[PDB]
Amino acid sequence: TCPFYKKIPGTGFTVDAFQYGVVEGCTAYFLTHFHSDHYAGLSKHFTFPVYCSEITGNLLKNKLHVQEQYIHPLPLDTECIVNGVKVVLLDANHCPGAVMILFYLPNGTVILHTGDFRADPSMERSLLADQKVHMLYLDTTYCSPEYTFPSQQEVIRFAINTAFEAVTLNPHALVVCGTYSIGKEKVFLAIADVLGSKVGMSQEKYKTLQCLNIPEINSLITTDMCSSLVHLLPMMQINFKGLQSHLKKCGGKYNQILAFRPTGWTHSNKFTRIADVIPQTKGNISIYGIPYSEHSSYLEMKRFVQWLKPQKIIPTVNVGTWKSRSTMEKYFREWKLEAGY
């Protein structure tokens, strides 16, 4: 049954609630981004209205085969009316098409649902600056102080230099990148750019990237593996056995694989810097895990919430244990006391 933290009170609205069948009294279903835990339930046999971004729209149409009539895309940074309630979609700085949603309730209450996000100081100069937020439904994925990680810019610099070096030393070395969802496209595209290659992928994956309104995308990707020296594979296949297997398949064109696994956080972040990261090697195969996060670090989250100063916070991640809930409420109190709201 639909949990409370996916219901928007004083509306007929839910957010990311597609796996509970028909939710008693919902007139419009919001989808924040195209990730499977969030869209779980949608299919071609869905007949209620779905509100989302243009890009999340292209993906529901073309990947899930939801029918054109039930997909309601909205532009970002624009005041829009939906069943008599003013709403605004903002960029969540998560994966492509990922949005936060502001609800302006008839009674004067104002609600922000972050979906998944990586908080940034640039959000402090959006339409959020213009008025007061009473409730915050918050992505709390890394809501604990141990969770530190570098900026996206730093991680990309590391990857670019690592790849460029290894390929300038051995022109017969292949770079391979893992993927299982949308998001994190920058890793493989920035590596391809430094190497003057296009990225090579399956037909299912090419299709997915065609949905994302990436500028000049036809110039950056391809389904011809042979012409491309950066290859995407399913993340499951990023291990010694899977890569060895894939090296066989290239037909004596390459003698070395360098590979990148974009992890989230990993306990090595408590002891080591980005500059100091080392791969796992076995023969002509090396695999780097790199901490490219599309979620807030603890400090980024804290800063955002302290600037926003909401009256109530309702977490949407790590809600399933009493220990998690309790730990989060302590950090929310600390934040509120340190900042005076």
Query: Could you give the CA distance from residue 239 to residue 169 in angstroms, rounded to a whole number?
Result: 23
> CA angle at residue 100 from 320 to 147, to 5 degrees?
50
CB of 101 to Ni ion, least distance (A): 14
Tokens read off for 161 = 């230099």
Smallest distance, Ni ion to C-beta of residue 84, A = 29
Of residues 97 and 150, the one with the C-beta less far from Ni ion: 97
**Min dist. Cβ of residue 90 to Ni ion (A):** 16
Q: Give 323's Cβ-side CA count (13 Å radius).
A: 0
Q: Which is nearer to Ni ion, 116 or 185 (CB)?
A: 116
Whichever of 118 and 198 has its CB closer to Ni ion, that residue is 118
Which residues are within 8 A (CB) of 96 and not within 5 positions of it... i.e. 6 or more apart?
55, 182, 183, 185, 212, 213, 214
Residue among 116 and 300 whose Cβ is closer to Ni ion? 116
Least separation in angstroms between residue 296's CB and Ni ion is 12
Q: How many whole angstroms separate alpha carbon 296 and alpha carbon 142?
A: 7
Quick check: helix, strand or coil at residue 254? Answer: coil
d(CA 109, CA 104): 6
**Which residue type, as a one-letter code, is found at position 283?**
G
Q: Is 289 helix (H, G, I), strand (E, B) or coil?
A: strand
Name which of 306, 329, 312 is nearest 135 in CA terms.
Answer: 312
Which CB, 116 or 303, lies closer to Ni ion? 116
Task: For Ni ion, give the closer residue by CB, 127 or 317.
Answer: 317
DSSP 56-121: HHHHHHHTT---GGGEEE--SS--EEETTEEEEEEE-SSSTT-EEEEEE-TTS-EEEE--S----G
Interface positions with Ni ion (CB under 5 A): 35, 116
Nearest to 263 by CA among 183, 166, 208, 173: 183
CB of 116 vs Ni ion, minimal distance in Å: 4
Residue 153: its H or E element:
helix 152-169
Q: Classify strands 71-73 and 50-52 as parallel, antiparallel or unpaired.
A: parallel
Residue 198 beta carbon to Ni ion: minimum distance, rounded to whole angstroms:
27
List the beta bridge partners of residue 244.
Answer: none
Neighbour order of strands in the sheet with 110-113 = 80-82, 85-91, 99-104, 110-113, 135-138, 312-315
